[PDB]
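User: Show me an example of a complex going from sequences to structure tokens.

Assistant: Sure. Here are the input components:
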Amino acid sequence: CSCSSLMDKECVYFCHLDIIW
Amino acid sequence: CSCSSLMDKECVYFCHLDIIW
């Protein structure tokens, strides 16, 4: 995923899925 | 977690973690 600088209004529903969970 | 009716502005950073991942 690309990220919204330190999780914010747009980073996980996406990211803390396959990186680490 | 409690949820924001079908994921929205508030349901995963939290939920698609320990339920299913």
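The lines above are the inputs; the final block is the predicted structure for all two components together. The interface with chain A takes residues 7, 9, 11-13, 16-17, 21 of chain B (CB under 8 Å).
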